[PDB]
Ligand binder design. Sequence first.
Ligand SMILES: Cc1cc2nc3c(=O)[nH]c(=O)nc-3n(C[C@H](O)[C@H](O)[C@H](O)COP(=O)(O)O)c2cc1C
Length: 147
Amino acid sequence: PKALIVYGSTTGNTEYTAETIARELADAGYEVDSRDAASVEAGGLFEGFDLVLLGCSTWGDDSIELQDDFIPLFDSLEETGAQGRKVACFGCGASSYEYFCGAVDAIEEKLKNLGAEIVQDGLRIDGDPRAARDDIVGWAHDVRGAI
Ligand SMILES: Cc1cc2nc3c(=O)[nH]c(=O)nc-3n(C[C@H](O)[C@H](O)[C@H](O)COP(=O)(O)O)c2cc1C
């Protein structure tokens, strides 16, 4: 299968997460395209992908704010070709915040609204993602099993 991974990461945690996931899928034989949301154009971005994994860190305090680089893609998510697309979301956050990984929640709801096929529940990482490598690898393993 061909998987596209697009991540928004301010301090590199969601980015580490996306590389962990990319490696897990590549090891299994998938063709993987892992791109920073900052370098992507939304227009037909998901076309030709069997699977699309969207990663985004959560910002804000009393409001969910999406990682800055992910914002333009989320704002134009309806142009990506998500309808019928197998997708899944992951992201880094902090459980002490009101909306822990609320960015995963917002993106998943938009994907749902665009007719995307959410193959697995979102991966929500609390704190340093390197300390949750087992969960990341496990979630990537489950997503492959799920498509
Ligand atoms: C000012 C500020 C606001 C934050 N807001 C949230 C939040 O609302 N929910 C959450 O789960 N984490 C929140 N975080 C935690 C970050 O999402 C977390 O540090 C994450 O690991 C950063 O991932 P990144 O390096 O891929 O951008 C916040 C962090 C800061 C510093």
